Amino acid sequence: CAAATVRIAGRDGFCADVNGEGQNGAAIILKKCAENDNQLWTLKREATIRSNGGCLTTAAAEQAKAGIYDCTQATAELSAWEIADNGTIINPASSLVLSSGAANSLLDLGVQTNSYASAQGWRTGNETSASVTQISGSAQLCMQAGNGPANLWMSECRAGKAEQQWALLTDKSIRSETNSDNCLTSAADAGPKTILLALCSGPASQRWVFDDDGSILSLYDDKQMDSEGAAAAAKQIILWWNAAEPNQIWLALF
């Protein structure tokens, strides 16, 4: 009703941190998630994400990088941020979004343009670990990993097999539970080819988000998770647009 305090996770479950502590001009890095004071961000009513007393500002020593700064010494436009369900955290004035070049600890956090990448996907919330759930879809069929985790269609649910289990990371990426290295990928969507599993390269094509309309949307192309028709036990899944098909509906039973 005025001011709440949570955490900000992202790339491969790494947390958004403030280089040690410092004050004014201290860059933000990707640090392992812990209950640190320099790890907690206060989301406020005027849209200014503040931490150790300072606001999160966009600097430009030439480029653009997240950083802390006196909320009074900084220009509004540089202190107002905007978080959306797609998993994006943008600065309306600049039009630049929070991004993480590489998935490495203590790696400086940078601000770039909206590629809708997975390297730019975040998740504000105290719970930061990966949510391991069971994704159910068309005709009460579960999502499994066809062949060696490299392709995936649908199959009956066993109710206890890790092949149909999936991990949801804070970077809006659907990964496997027994191999959090590879994750849901897209393709050259322009012409229903197929969705499968490759190693998490962090492109704007491995980022999904579960919308309230009941489906999984991929911010990049605004397409949703669909099936080729019905064949689910040895076939494939594609990316198609808003057709309100009941087949585009999925539910992550946790």
Binding site: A4, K44, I83, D85, E127, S136, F210, D212, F254
Partner: protein
């Protein structure tokens, strides 16, 4: 005895008691309801032994139920509810309310110790058409019909059941979700200035009985699950 028939069923329940949404999740109508529109009637048949439920469309509570020539209002029923519910019947009053803490006290059992599915509300309705020790049949009815419209997750529990063709009880997953329906909402409506971040940690359990401390709305357990939200603000 079908998922579609049951799906369509709760669907008609979700889009019949909902005014404009907030975070994409609809919300029940506020005090802007005339006693001449605060009550919704739902029918339920089986071996042809059918009942009628009188739910409150503001908060989704069962204020009474009909049995041919007899109606039975919960103790927490306001006066103005008897004079325009199943008036043309032989009214009656119960010794408990629609709360679980109440119907739990009655039954002497509870949701976690109560099987659900088709082969459950099947006999649930029977006890009703007939009479007494129907407290339990309220657990496996309110939960199977009402608590499944607010959470897509409990519907997929009562759905994955008809699927697998078995029976089952309510785990810590549905219970936490169920009893946190008032907080959730409040926390998702009071959380507009913090833009997607509550003020405390609501704990919901996963299917593997793993406690989850939800802090914001940016979790699937919220945006995908909540289907109908209670109207409270800040």
């Amino acid at each position: 005895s079908t998922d579609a028939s049951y799906n369509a069923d709760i669907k008609e329940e979700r889009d019949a008691a909902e005014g404009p949404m907030a975070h994409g999740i609809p919300a029940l109508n506020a005090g802007a309801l005339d006693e001449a529109r605060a009550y919704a009637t739902v029918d339920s048949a089986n071996t042809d032994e059918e009942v009628s439920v009188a739910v409150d469309v503001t908060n989704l509570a069962v204020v009474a139920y009909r049995a041919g020539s007899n109606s039975y209002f919960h103790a927490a029923a306001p006066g103005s509810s008897l004079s325009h519910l199943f008036s043309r019947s032989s009214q009656h009053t119960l010794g408990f309310d629609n709360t679980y803490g109440d119907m739990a006290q009655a039954a002497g059992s509870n949701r976690k110790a109560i099987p659900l599915g088709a082969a459950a509300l099947e006999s649930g309705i029977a006890s009703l058409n007939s009479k007494n020790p129907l407290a339990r049949t309220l657990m496996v009815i309110i939960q199977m019909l009402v608590e499944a419209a607010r959470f897509r997750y409990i519907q997929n529990n009562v759905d994955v059941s008809i699927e697998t063709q078995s029976a089952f009880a309510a785990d810590a997953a549905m219970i936490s979700l169920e009893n946190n329906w008032a907080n959730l909402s409040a926390l998702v409506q009071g959380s507009s200035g913090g833009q997607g971040t509550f003020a405390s940690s609501a704990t919901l359990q996963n299917a593997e009985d793993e406690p989850i401390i939800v802090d914001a709305v940016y979790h699937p357990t919220v945006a995908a699950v909540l289907a109908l939200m209670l109207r409270k603000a800040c």
